[PDB]
From a paper:
However, only a dozen of the corresponding gene products were biochemically characterized including the tetrachloroethene RDase (PceA) of the epsilonproteobacterium Sulfurospirillum multivorans. PceA was described to mediate the reductive dehalogenation of chlorinated and brominated ethenes or propenes. The crystal structure of PceA showed the norpseudo-B12 non-covalently bound in its ‘base-off’ conformation deeply inside the protein. The two [4Fe–4S] clusters of PceA connect the surface and cobamide cofactor at distances short enough to allow intramolecular electron transfer to the active site and potentially also from the proximal Fe–S cluster to the substrate.
Several monoaromatic halogenated compounds up to the size of 2,4,6-TBP were visualized in the active site pocket. Restricted by the protein environment, the phenol ring of 2,4,6-TBP is oriented at an angle of approximately 40° away from the surface normal vector of the corrin ring and enclosed by Trp96, Tyr382, Trp56, Trp376, Tyr102 and Tyr246. The hydroxyl group of 2,4,6-TBP is located 4.7 Å away from the cobalt and 2.4 Å from the Tyr246-OH. The bromine substituent at C2 is fully enclosed, while the bromine at C6 points towards the substrate channel and the bromine at C4 towards the upper cavity, where it is restrained in its position by Tyr102 and Tyr382. The hydrogen at C3 points at the Tyr382 phenyl group. The two rings interact in an edge-to-face geometry, precluding a bulky halogen substituent at this place. Hence, binding of the planar, triangular 2,4,6-TBP to PceA with a bromine substituent towards Co is likely to be impossible and would place the other bromine substituents in conflict with the aromatic ring of Tyr382 or into the substrate channel between Tyr102 and Phe38, a position too narrow to accommodate a bromine. The low Km value for 2,4,6-TBP supports the reliability of the analysed enzyme–substrate complex, since it indicates a high affinity for the substrate without any steric hindrance in substituent positioning. For 2,4,6-TBP, the bromine substituents adjacent to the hydroxyl group seem to be preferentially removed and could accept electrons from the aromatic ring as well as from the cobalt ion itself, considering their distance of approximately 5.8 and 6.6 Å from the cobalt. We show that in PceA phenolic substrates are excluded from direct interaction with [CoII] and most likely [CoI] by a tight packing of aromatic side chains that places the substrate at an angle of 40° against the surface normal vector of the corrin ring, where it is kept at a distance of 4.7 Å from the cobalt.
Numbering used by the authors:
A (entry chain A): 1 to 413, 431 to 462
B (entry chain B): 7 to 394, 431 to 461
The structure:
Amino acid sequence: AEKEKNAAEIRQQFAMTAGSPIIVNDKLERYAEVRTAFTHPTSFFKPNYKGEVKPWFLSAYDEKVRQIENGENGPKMKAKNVGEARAGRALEAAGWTLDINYGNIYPNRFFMLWSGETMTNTQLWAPVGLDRRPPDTTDPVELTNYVKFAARMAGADLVGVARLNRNWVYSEAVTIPADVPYEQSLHKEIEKPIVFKDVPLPIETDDELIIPNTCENVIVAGIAMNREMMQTAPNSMACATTAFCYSRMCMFDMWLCQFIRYMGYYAIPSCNGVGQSVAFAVEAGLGQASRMGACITPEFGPNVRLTKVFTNMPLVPDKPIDFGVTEFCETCKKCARECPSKAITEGPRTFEGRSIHNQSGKLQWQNDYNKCLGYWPESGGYCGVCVAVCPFTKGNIWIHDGVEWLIDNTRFLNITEVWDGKINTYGLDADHFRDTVSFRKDRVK
Amino acid sequence: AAEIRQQFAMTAGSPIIVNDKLERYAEVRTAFTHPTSFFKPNYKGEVKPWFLSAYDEKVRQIENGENGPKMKAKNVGEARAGRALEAAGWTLDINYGNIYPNRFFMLWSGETMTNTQLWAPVGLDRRPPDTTDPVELTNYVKFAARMAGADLVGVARLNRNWVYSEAVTIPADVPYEQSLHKEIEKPIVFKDVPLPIETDDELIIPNTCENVIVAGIAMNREMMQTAPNSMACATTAFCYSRMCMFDMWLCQFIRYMGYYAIPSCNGVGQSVAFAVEAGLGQASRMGACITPEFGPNVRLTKVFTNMPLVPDKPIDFGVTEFCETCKKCARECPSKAITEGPRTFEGRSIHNQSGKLQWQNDYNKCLGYWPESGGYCGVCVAVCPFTKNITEVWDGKINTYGLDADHFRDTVSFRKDRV
Ligand SMILES: Oc1c(Br)cc(Br)cc1Br
Ligand SMILES: Oc1c(Br)cc(Br)cc1Br
Ligand code: SF4
Ligand code: SF4
Ligand code: SF4
Ligand code: SF4
C-alpha cells in the first residue's frame, strides 16, 4: 500500500552534519547590493515596446497597459476578454500593498525598522514593558521552539535557523536618506555600508548601518506561492502569487521581530534587503541551491519565497539538507532550455561570476541576470518560467520504496480556468498543507 | 462543506427580525468606549482605562509565573512568552480593532497609499471598470478574498440598520501618540456623492454603496481552548492583524478594478449582523456569528463597495433551536454576562441595540472580567459545541497562520461555490 507522505521523515532522512554547505574560495568578498540587476546602472534601464529607454519597471508598466487594452494576460497570450486581462493586473497590483518599491530593501525605513520603539504597536503596549524587561528565557532549546511556533503563526510555511554568515550580508545596502519622503524615494536612493561593531543594539548613523557583533543568528522563513497561479508563468497570475507573497513576507518580518523584541532580544527584519536570502536558506536547511539559482525545498521546490530576520536571541541552528538537488540539476537543465531569455547556464558550476550581478568566490551555477531582467519589460511581468517548469515545483515528486524516500525520476523526463478553479486561504493547497504541520520534535531536537 | 452550505441555504431576505423601534447605534455605546464602562480598577484598586488595568494584571502574572488568573505557568519564561506572542500579534492593528474610519490602515481612498503611488503609471485605479457583470465580479472578488486571507467570504446587500450612526475616531491631524486621549464622535451619513469622502463634520458613504463583503478569519482551536489564558489572547491578536491585511488587500483589488471600497475591521458597523445577512453563519446565544466550519471561533471583517455583486443566501443549520436548549456558554461565563433567558427586542443596557430579536447580554459584565483575568477571555467561544495546558500548546501541533490541515479542505473553493 502507498505510504502516506511524511515531510518530517523526508527532512530527517536527508539531514547533513553541521557546516555551511556552500563551497567558497579566496576571491570571495561581500557583495554590494547596488550590483543586483534591479538596481545597477548597467541593467536598470530597459527599452519598452516602443523602443523608449526607461527604468525597467516603467517599461514593464507600459507592457501591462498594452496587454489590458489588447485583452491579453501575457505576451501574445490572449485573455478571455479585456475584463479578465484587467482583473489579473488588479490582483497583481493589490498583492504588493504591504511592500515598498518592490522588495522592501531599504533597511530601517518604512516597514523594515531595526528598532521597535516608534511602532504604533510598541507604543500601545509600552506599559507592560515587554521590550524593556530582560529575557526570562536564555535556553536556546526553549527559545528555538518558541520562536518557530511564533514564525508559523506569523505566516511562515517553512522556518529554519542558522548561525549568521557575514559573507552573505551585503557590504553596502541600497537605501534612502532618513529625511526623504516616500514620493521621492525612487529618485533619492543611495548606498550605505553595513558594518559590524561592538554596540548593544542595531543602530543607524548618518554614515553606517551598524549590526552588533552579538548578532549571532538568522531565522529564515519560506512563504509558499500558489502552484496553479505560478504555472501560468510568464503571464499575469504568476505575477499575482509573487506579489501577495511579498506582502506576506513583510507581515512575517514585523510580527516575528516584535515577538523577539517582546522576549527581551533585538531583531532586524530584511525581506529582500540586507543579505542574500538563498544562501541563508541553504545554511538554515530549508533546501539546496539549484541551477536556476533559487533554493529548492522538498515541500515546494523553488516555488516558495524567502525572508529572514537577524537576532542575538540564543537559538539552536538547524542542520543543512542534501536530498540530491545538485545531482538532479547536473542532468536536468529544463529551466535553462525553457528560459525565454537564455539567462540560465547549461554548463558546470564555477567560482567565477558571469558578470557584475554575480558574487564571485562561491561554487554555483552562474547565470546572466541582466538577460533575465530584460525579459520582464518584454513580458510585462516577473516571468517565473524557470520556477514553473522545474520538476521540484510539482506536488508529486516523492515516493517511498518500502525502506526510504526517493525522488521519482519520471518527473525529469489557461488563466480563465485558474480564476474558475481551486483556491483556498492565502492560496495554500489543502491537498498538501499537511506537509507543513509541526510538533515540538521537528522544531528543536 | 460546500455540500452542507447549499443544503442549509434559506430563501433570500434578511433573517434578523426587527420592530419599528430599531434605530442605528452610536459606536461610542460599546463597552470598550462608553464612559460608564471604560474605567475599571486594577488588582491594586487603582481605577484606570480598562486596558491599562488589564496590562497591570499581565505584568503581575508574568512576575508570578502565571499564564492566566490563578493558572500557574511552567515557569516565568513560559508566562513571558505567551504575553510576548499576544503583544506581537497586534502589530498591524491600531488601538485594538482599527475602528477609526479613514485613519491609519483604514483609508477610504487608496490615493495616498505607497502601493497606489508606485502603481500610478498603470492607472488601474483611474480606469473605468472593464467588468460590470455581477456574476463575474463575484467570482473575481471572492477569489481575491481567499488570496487575501479569508477562510470564509460572503456578500450581502448593505443594510444601513447595522452601520453605526456615529463613529469613534480622531481628528485627522492628531498624531498616534495622542490618539487615545483625543477620540471623538463623528456621524456616518449617506449622500448622493461620487466617492466615499470625509469632511470636517461627516463621514460620507455614497448612496451607490450597495454591497458589503464579509470575511471570516479562522482562529486556532488549540489556543482558543486555553481561554481565558494568554494563548487565547494570542490567536485573537494575530487574527486582528490578518483582518487588517485582508481589508487593505481587498480594497486595493476593488479599486484597481475601477470601483471604490471602504475597509473597516471592527469599525463602521456591526460585523455579526453583516455576517448573518451574508450567509456566513447564524446568530447565537453568546452573541457571535456561529459558522458551520468553525462555530464562533472565527473573526469577522468587512468591506463596503459599489462593485456589482450577487448576494449570497442566508443559511439556517439549526443554531437558534440548539442555542434554545444548550446554555453552556451562559453557565461557564465567568462574569455571568450571557443570558439564560429567551430572545427579546429590548436591550439590557446602553451597550445593546434595541429593536432586533436577539439574546440580550450584559457586555459591561463581560468587559469587567478582562482586567481581572488579564486577557480577552473567550471562554464562551471555547466551550461552544459548534467550536469543536499551555505547555502542551507550545509543544504541540501548529501550522501556517494557525490553520489546521485536518480541516483546511473544508474551505477549498471552486467557481461553483463562489457564485
Ligand atoms: O523580486 C521582485 C522585485 Br524586487 C520586483 C518586482 Br517588480 C518583481 C519581483 Br518577483
Ligand atoms: O476585540 C478586542 C478589542 Br477591540 C480589544 C482587545 Br484588548 C481585545 C479584543 Br478580543
Ligand atoms: S529545472 Fe531542473 S536543472 Fe533547473 S533548477 Fe529545476 S531540477 Fe535544477
Ligand atoms: S525568471 Fe524567466 S527570464 Fe528569468 S531566469 Fe527564470 S525563466 Fe529565465
Ligand atoms: S468573553 Fe468571557 S466574560 Fe465575556 S461573555 Fe464570553 S465567557 Fe463571558
Ligand atoms: S454554547 Fe450553546 S447556547 Fe452558547 S452559543 Fe454555543 S450552542 Fe449556543
